[PDB]
Amino acid sequence: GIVQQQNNLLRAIEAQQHLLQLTVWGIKQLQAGGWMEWDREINNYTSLAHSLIEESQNQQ
Amino acid sequence: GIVQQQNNLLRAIEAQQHLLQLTVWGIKQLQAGGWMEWDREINNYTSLAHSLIEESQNQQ
Amino acid sequence: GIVQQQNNLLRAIEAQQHLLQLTVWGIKQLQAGGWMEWDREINNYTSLAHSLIEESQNQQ
Numbered sequence: 049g050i051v052q053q054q055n056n057l058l059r060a061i062e063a064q065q066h067l068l069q070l071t072v073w074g075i076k077q078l079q080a081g082g083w084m085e086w087d088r089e090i091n092n093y094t095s096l097a098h099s100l101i102e103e104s105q106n107q108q
Numbered sequence: 109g110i111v112q113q114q115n116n117l118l119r120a121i122e123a124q125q126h127l128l129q130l131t132v133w134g135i136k137q138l139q140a141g142g143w144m145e146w147d148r149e150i151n152n153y154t155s156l157a158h159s160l161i162e163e164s165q166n167q168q
Numbered sequence: 169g170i171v172q173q174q175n176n177l178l179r180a181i182e183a184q185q186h187l188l189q190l191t192v193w194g195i196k197q198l199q200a201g202g203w204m205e206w207d208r209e210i211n212n213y214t215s216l217a218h219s220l221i222e223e224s225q226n227q228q
Binding site: 050051054057058061064065068071072075078079083086089090093094096097100101103104107108 | 110112113114116117119120121123124126127128130131133134135138
């Protein structure tokens, strides 16, 4: 029921986290100074998302 | 239980929304005409996602 | 209740999947050899996410 649904949703979020990591990687490749804040934010939100994912995986 | 799980999932989606905003911003920086439709779609889906997030936050 | 919440979460994920597709498209436009693995991973995780979304839509 709802449990199977939540597992489905978490897996979708996990797959999208991989896509996000890939697009971030691609953008870094294209920018080749000035991107320091961008890097900082990307790192922080990526770590935040990761922690939430791991917490959900353990919870489920 | 499932309630705590849904809160976890929403937070993960919120963190990923920030990452999406950042990658969009990065791409716009790199493209410097022809991106009018891309801009339109990005704006529409970003607003759509935002509205869904806000609705979920209020609901939870 | 939780059911309406899960529907909200799925829709948010669906909107974010569109944004991901758009940023991927934008990056491909900017890279114009060497991106073969990137392309492979993007395709695989995009298909994975799609399958999870479709499964959730049918389930909900």
